[PDB]
């Protein structure tokens, strides 16, 4: 038996499970499509109800994978997509959202993010997001790859206080946000979505992670996700094209990391002692 996945609250009061699902690199190989769809469906069945995608991912292909996975069960998914900054003018953002809705085969996305900071005024992107919300095409908007200075600029734009999430790189190998951005977002009540929670697989070769996983009869990936489960105000979004790995990732939530485990992880993956440049992928 599994314990329920912990939930994370958005500023609007909506709650989502702390473990979701990613889709970057899905939709590239026709031989993998069926299993990518099955992976997302399996995750939905197991309570990993947030699914993260973007217009960038295969230029609509990953969105179409998500659209297939949610057929006949839209209400059970919390769908996140994104607008590229090169499209984030007011008219551009509306057009991007319409393309995303068509690829996803849905009326409304749950959360719509600015993918990173670009050249169009933030006030204009936010105005588009608010228009889309009033139109019933998105339920909430947020940002991604926003450092502390980028977050500060939201207070200078109308409706900037409505930001629902900041999706940034966060995993055991990439802990920089702990010094500043993560405490700020927690204090604002803005969830951090931890992208690349396995560091795209790179973290899984770490000696200490392998050591701790062995002690729990678990995998390194499960320990990496279990670490993020201990971080309040964080939603992790691991990606896998394998339904077997979707099941494994769900089971990461059953790991009980000890006080000693957490101290050991901090020795091997040192938290930041000073402000550091936001790491991105
Ligand atoms: N906002 C942004 O700028 C960004 C957003 N993202 C989002 O975050 C999501 C997750 O990050 P992502 O970059 O995909 O990388 P992840 O850290 O989620 O790692 C994905 C890799 O790990 C493998 N994998 C998954 N589960 C396991 C497991 N249990 N054991 C071993 N290997 C495993 C996958 O292989 P396989 O699929 O073959 O199983 C894949 O190669 C993205 O898919 C995207 O939705 C990511 C980067 C940037």
TrEMBL record:
GO terms assigned for molecular function: nucleotide binding; oxidoreductase activity
UniProt keyword list: Nucleotide-binding, Oxidoreductase
EC number: 1.1.1.-
Binding annotation for NADP(+): 23-24, 52, 144-145, 196, 198, 200, 239-241, 245, 248-249
Binding residue positions for substrate: 115
Entries under InterPro entries matching the protein: AKR, NAD(P)_OxRdtase_dom_sf, NADP_OxRdtase_dom
Domain NADP-dependent oxidoreductase: 19-268
Keyword Nucleotide-binding included in the entry's annotation: yes
Positions marked as site (Lowers pKa of active site Tyr): 82
Catalytic residues in the record: 57 (proton donor)
Domain of life: Bacteria
EC class of the enzyme, as a word: oxidoreductase
Entry binding sites for NADPH: 23-24, 52, 144-145, 196, 198, 200, 239-241, 245, 248-249
Name this protein carries in UniProt: Oxidoreductase
